Amino acid sequence: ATRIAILGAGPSGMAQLRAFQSAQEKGAEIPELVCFEKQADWGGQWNYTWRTGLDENGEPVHSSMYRYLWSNGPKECLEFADYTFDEHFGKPIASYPPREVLWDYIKGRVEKAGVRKYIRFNTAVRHVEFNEDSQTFTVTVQDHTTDTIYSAAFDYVVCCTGHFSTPYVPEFEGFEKFGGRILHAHDFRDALEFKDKTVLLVGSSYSAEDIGSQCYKYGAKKLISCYRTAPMGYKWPENWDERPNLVRVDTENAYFADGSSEKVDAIILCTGYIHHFPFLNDDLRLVTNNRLWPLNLYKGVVWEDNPKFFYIGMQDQWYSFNMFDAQAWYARDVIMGRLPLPSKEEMKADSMAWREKELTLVTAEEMYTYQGDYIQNLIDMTDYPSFDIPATNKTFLEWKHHKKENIMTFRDHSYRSLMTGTMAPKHHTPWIDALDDSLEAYLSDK
Amino acid sequence: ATRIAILGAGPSGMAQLRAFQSAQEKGAEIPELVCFEKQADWGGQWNYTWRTGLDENGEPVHSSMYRYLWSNGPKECLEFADYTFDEHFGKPIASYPPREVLWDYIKGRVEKAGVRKYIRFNTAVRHVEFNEDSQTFTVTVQDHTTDTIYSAAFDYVVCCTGHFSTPYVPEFEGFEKFGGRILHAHDFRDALEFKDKTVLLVGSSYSAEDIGSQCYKYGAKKLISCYRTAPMGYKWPENWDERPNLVRVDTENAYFADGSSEKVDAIILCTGYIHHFPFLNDDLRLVTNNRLWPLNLYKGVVWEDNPKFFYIGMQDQWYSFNMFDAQAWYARDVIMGRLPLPSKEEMKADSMAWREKELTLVTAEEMYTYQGDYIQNLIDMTDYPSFDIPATNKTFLEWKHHKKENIMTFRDHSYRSLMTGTMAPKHHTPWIDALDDSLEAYLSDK
Numbered sequence: 069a070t071r072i073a074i075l076g077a078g079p080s081g082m083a084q085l086r087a088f089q090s091a092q093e094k095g096a097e098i099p100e101l102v103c104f105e106k107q108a109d110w111g112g113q114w115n116y117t118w119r120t121g122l123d124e125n126g127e128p129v130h131s132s133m134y135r136y137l138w139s140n141g142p143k144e145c146l147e148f149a150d151y152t153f154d155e156h157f158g159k160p161i162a163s164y165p166p167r168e169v170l171w172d173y174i175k176g177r178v179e180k181a182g183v184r185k186y187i188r189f190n191t192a193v194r195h196v197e198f199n200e201d202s203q204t205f206t207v208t209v210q211d212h213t214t215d216t217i218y219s220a221a222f223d224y225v226v227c228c229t230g231h232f233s234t235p236y237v238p239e240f241e242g243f244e245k246f247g248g249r250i251l252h253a254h255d256f257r258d259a260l261e262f263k264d265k266t267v268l269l270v271g272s273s274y275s276a277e278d279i280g281s282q283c284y285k286y287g288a289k290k291l292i293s294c295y296r297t298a299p300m301g302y303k304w305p306e307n308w309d310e311r312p313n314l315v316r317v318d319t320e321n322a323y324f325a326d327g328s329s330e331k332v333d334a335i336i337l338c339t340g341y342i343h344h345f346p347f348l349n350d351d352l353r354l355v356t357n358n359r360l361w362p363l364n365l366y367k368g369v370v371w372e373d374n375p376k377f378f379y380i381g382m383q384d385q386w387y388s389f390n391m392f393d394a395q396a397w398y399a400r401d402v403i404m405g406r407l408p409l410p411s412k413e414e415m416k417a418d419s420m421a422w423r424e425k426e427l428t429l430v431t432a433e434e435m436y437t438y439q440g441d442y443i444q445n446l447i448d449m450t451d452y453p454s455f456d457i458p459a460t461n462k463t464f465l466e467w468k469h470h471k472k473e474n475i476m477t478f479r480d481h482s483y484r485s486l487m488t489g490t491m492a493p494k495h496h497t498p499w500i501d502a503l504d505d506s507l508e509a510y511l512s513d514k
Numbered sequence: 515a516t517r518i519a520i521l522g523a524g525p526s527g528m529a530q531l532r533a534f535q536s537a538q539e540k541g542a543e544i545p546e547l548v549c550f551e552k553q554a555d556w557g558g559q560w561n562y563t564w565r566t567g568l569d570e571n572g573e574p575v576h577s578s579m580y581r582y583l584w585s586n587g588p589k590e591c592l593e594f595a596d597y598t599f600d601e602h603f604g605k606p607i608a609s610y611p612p613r614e615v616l617w618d619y620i621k622g623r624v625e626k627a628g629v630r631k632y633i634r635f636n637t638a639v640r641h642v643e644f645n646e647d648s649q650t651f652t653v654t655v656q657d658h659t660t661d662t663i664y665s666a667a668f669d670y671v672v673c674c675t676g677h678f679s680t681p682y683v684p685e686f687e688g689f690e691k692f693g694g695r696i697l698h699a700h701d702f703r704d705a706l707e708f709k710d711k712t713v714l715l716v717g718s719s720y721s722a723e724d725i726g727s728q729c730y731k732y733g734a735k736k737l738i739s740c741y742r743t744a745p746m747g748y749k750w751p752e753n754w755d756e757r758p759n760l761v762r763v764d765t766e767n768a769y770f771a772d773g774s775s776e777k778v779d780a781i782i783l784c785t786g787y788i789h790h791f792p793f794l795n796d797d798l799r800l801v802t803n804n805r806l807w808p809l810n811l812y813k814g815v816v817w818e819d820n821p822k823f824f825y826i827g828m829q830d831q832w833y834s835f836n837m838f839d840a841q842a843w844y845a846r847d848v849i850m851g852r853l854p855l856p857s858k859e860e861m862k863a864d865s866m867a868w869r870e871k872e873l874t875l876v877t878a879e880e881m882y883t884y885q886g887d888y889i890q891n892l893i894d895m896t897d898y899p900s901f902d903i904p905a906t907n908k909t910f911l912e913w914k915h916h917k918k919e920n921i922m923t924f925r926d927h928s929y930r931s932l933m934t935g936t937m938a939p940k941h942h943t944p945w946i947d948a949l950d951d952s953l954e955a956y957l958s959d960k
């Protein structure tokens with residue numbers, strides 16, 4: 069009786085469970101499933117917590133999400149092909165929902181699927197070891213409800229623990245004497261903490277854009293963004309400027325490669341994350357920077373040194389929810405014997421060709437399109453519903469232009485669903501004025 | 515060739531190395547020693563970092579220490595019996611040195627001992643397993659310098675990883691709505707971050723007393739302390755009050771079991787720590803609250819279910835540095851065969867009698883005196899130099915009275931060394947006015 073361990077109940081682990089349940093619903097015999105989740109509820113990043121650093125059990129706090137976060141790209145680019153926004157909400161809604169709204173949506177699918185029963189919440193995965201003599205994995209966990217550590221044997225293991233939770237936090241000279249708060253983006257919670265302050269944001273990617281936008285929207289006095297290689301380059305509001313990189317700090321001031329200098333109240337390092345798996349030894353352990361094509365993953369999913377071990381969602385993410393689906397459906401089919409694996413040599417050659425293409429990429433359009441091609445290849449192999457990928461790529465193109473037009477109003481635009489054709493209505497309140505982030509305020513009138 | 519693993523190079527792991535080195539200096543053959551330390555330098559808590567949450571490798575940040583921290587008790591109560599303050603500094607100093615000064619002192623002893631060579635820095639212990647078949651331990655670590663995970667075999671393991679680093683962080687109704695910073699004492703770094711703010715401190719023990727004192731000294735507008743059981747009782751300054759526990763928080767305000775309420779800018783949970791050992795399964799893992807006599811430790815040191823495993827410094831700490839010495843010398847002597855262990859039944863009965871006495875303790879004096887008795891029993895069994903414990907107890911008595919007299923000036927008093935007899939002079943600057951926490955300002959004549 070074959071047995072599967074799924075590590076994590078975020079979007080990826082939820083998709084993995086959904087994938088199996090869907091095969092079962094069609095009448096197939098499926099493996100026994102156990103899913104381990106260290107948090108008290110599913111949803112992963114989208115499960116908000118006020119906690120910071122270490123959680124109530126002493127495990128690293130997982131979510132990096134903050135008050136007032138809304139979708140960074142069109143919801144239409146992340147809609148599940150087997151569970152639409154229309155089905156879930158019963159009505160059209162706008163295109164960039166707040167966190168709690170997206171959280172409600174991803175949970176809706178697995179509530180309907182009835183797969184909560186497979187999950188052991190409040191349980192941290194400590195160790196995964198492969199045993200050569202038995203060809204099984206031993207998974208060791210800590211159940212923080214009973215405060216006991218136990219282990220169990222599995223035939224296959226699917227790792228869904230994310231890669232945007234363990235921060236990359238570089239040091240700058242003087243940090244030990246600066247008098248204001250220093251935090252990583254991962255620790256950022258309520259933008260109101262910085263009302264009427266001067267905030268320095270170190271970095272120039274999605275985290276800097278959006279955390280600065282929150283500080284702006286909720287009333288920071290002044291924002292400074294500094295970049296290591298090139299500026300974000302958007303037209304920012306009046307109280308926000310982009311400088312070349314921080315070089316040092318003193319008691320109160322930041323100094324930049326500019327020769328400029330000024331007083332700053334708080335420093336937020338928006339400097340990204342590391343791939344970190346403390347429960348894996350080197351035989352199973354993925355080591356990569358954040359990118360579209362990590363190596364050693366056949367079809368981006370199958371660990372090439374031991375193809376009884378799988379990874380979901382370890383790539384950088386233009387696409388997200390329906391990419392995890394495409395991967396989870398594929399992992400499922402491999403595990404079930406529907407898609408036999410080629411030799412290790414063929415895997416290696418295939419992965420090298422995908423890496424060669426990855427190194428070629430220059431524009432944003434080339435990047436999301438490459439990821440669409442990856443997804444296309446996955447959904448063609450499986451009964452996951454095909455959806456219109458070139459039309460999703462075109463939605464990304466529109467979104468890109470909207471950001472360039474005006475970085476503060478991109479969230480005020482609407483797109484059509486590629487699953488239903490339903491056009492998103494305009495939201496009742498422009499983003500800059502929509503201060504309440506609750507699901508109730510978003511879905512109600514006003 | 516017998517082999518020992520020492521887990522941690524704070525004061526306890528340094529003492530364990532010092533104990534073995536001292537035996538060797540006297541002419542004995544010692545085992546091979548390997549010490550693993552996840553930080554880049556030794557000193558444990560006393561090694562200051564600006565970092566918070568997770569460290570540069572993604573390991574939990576260890577030190578809970580903050581800017582401007584000074585010794586909480588007389589230095590005379592923590593003086594090494596084999597390496598005096600007079601030897602280290604070459605002159606008298608006042609009785610409550612700043613963190614950097616005490617760090618320099620603890621490093622001084624192990625610099626002189628030459629024990630740096632046994633330590634692998636930037637290396638995090640992941641797992642310790644005991645193999646019944648070989649009667650050895652397998653220690654698996656991650657070397658963050660080479661990003662390599664490897665394991666090695668040991669005959670004995672001494673755990674020195676501390677118990678004041680994994681926070682106990684209780685949740686209060688409304689924390690997910692509150693607009694200012696919420697942090698644990700463990701994340702507290704520079705008190706200047708709170709200058710001109712209203713700060714609520716949840717708790718009523720050493721962390722609350724001292725973090726409040728720092729916020730006060732460096733210019734917080736207003737301080738509130740709230741207690742769960744009973745108030746700290748000291749006479750606080752004008753802008754600081756104590757009241758019954760927090761019950762809930764909204765967007766801007768804290769509400770107390772009082773019926774009282776007010777606007778607060780930051781909340782600091784001074785609610786203590788948990789014993790947390792993510793690298794130990796239940797066969798080896800100590801489970802206890804913070805107290806003078808944890809169970810399952812023969813002489814407070816030998817793990818009773820597997821007496822080839824040892825714990826140093828897991829008790830609550832009135833005494834500290836020379837308690838770790840007493841423990842480390844004892845662990846050393848059992849490892850080397852100088853002090854054969856009694857049967858498991860005898861160990862149990864001994865530990866029970868120590869626990870029975872512990873539950874008897876009511877006053878502060880009874881508590882440090884019991885810990886003095888514990889230490890006496892250890893140093894009598896070993897060649898650690900005897901020192902005057904009743905005279906150390908009388909120094910605690912004076913310190914207690916000084917705190918009762920005035921909680922803001924207790925650090926301005928001086929005591930005599932029980933090791934050398936020499937009186938500590940008065941510091942050049944009253945604590946409230948000594949804003950500079952550097953070693954250089956402290957040791958200078960002005």
Ligand SMILES: Cc1cc2nc3c(=O)[nH]c(=O)nc-3n(C[C@H](O)[C@H](O)[C@H](O)COP(=O)(O)OP(=O)(O)OC[C@H]3O[C@@H](n4cnc5c(N)ncnc54)[C@H](O)[C@@H]3O)c2cc1C
Nearest residue numbers: 076078079080106112113139140192193229230232381388
């Ligand atoms: C700040 C931020 C904003 C984002 N915004 C968007 C957005 O607007 N749109 C979008 O499409 N994507 C966004 N993302 C991307 C995000 O990666 C995905 O949307 C999605 O959350 C990834 O799903 P996942 O399940 O792979 O990983 P995660 O959501 O990270 O979930 C991993 C799960 O693994 C669990 N886990 C980890 N370690 C252990 C362990 N040792 N034991 C047991 N359980 C463990 C965690 O508790 C968590 O539940 C954002 C990410 C961040 C960090």
Ligand SMILES: Cc1cc2nc3c(=O)[nH]c(=O)nc-3n(C[C@H](O)[C@H](O)[C@H](O)COP(=O)(O)OP(=O)(O)OC[C@H]3O[C@@H](n4cnc5c(N)ncnc54)[C@H](O)[C@@H]3O)c2cc1C
Nearest residue numbers: 522524525526552558559585586638639675676678827834
């Ligand atoms: C805020 C605060 C203030 C204090 N003030 C005083 C004071 O004024 N006077 C006093 O006498 N005592 C004070 N203490 C008490 C403190 O417990 C002791 O002084 C002393 O530091 C205990 O030493 P230790 O080596 O047992 O533990 P620690 O100092 O905590 O050191 C443990 C070592 O283990 C390492 N480690 C942990 N986990 C791993 C791992 N998995 N792998 C590898 N290495 C690991 C850590 O990096 C660390 O170096 C204070 C404690 C705190 C928290």
Ligand SMILES: CC(=O)c1ccc[n+]([C@@H]2O[C@@H](COP(=O)([O-])OP(=O)(O)OC[C@@H]3O[C@@H](n4cnc5c(N)ncnc54)[C@H](OP(=O)(O)O)[C@@H]3O)[C@@H](O)[C@H]2O)c1
Nearest residue numbers: 140141238271272273274275296297338339340358385386
């Ligand atoms: C479709 C869409 O909306 C989309 C597409 C992709 C990703 N995402 C989102 O983006 C992700 C989140 O993205 P992220 O911004 O958290 O992290 P990254 O993007 O990896 O880069 C931060 C990096 O930080 C900077 N940095 C690193 N070290 C630095 C240093 N020493 N000094 C100054 N800056 C430093 C880097 O600059 P440099 O390396 O010099 O440029 C780079 O800007 C996820 O949340 C995902 O959801 C969304």
Ligand SMILES: CC(=O)c1ccc[n+]([C@@H]2O[C@@H](COP(=O)([O-])OP(=O)(O)OC[C@@H]3O[C@@H](n4cnc5c(N)ncnc54)[C@H](OP(=O)(O)O)[C@@H]3O)[C@@H](O)[C@H]2O)c1
Nearest residue numbers: 586587684717718719720721722742743784785786831832
């Ligand atoms: C000789 C000497 O100087 C000495 C002696 C011992 C310790 N220390 C130092 O003190 C240590 C550090 O001591 P610490 O204050 O960090 O931790 P503890 O003392 O364990 O208690 C915090 C606890 O927090 C309170 N608390 C817990 N949950 C609460 C809740 N839900 N609401 C309100 N309050 C709550 C407890 O109240 P309650 O439980 O209700 O009282 C108690 O006050 C170390 O730094 C050590 O160096 C020094």
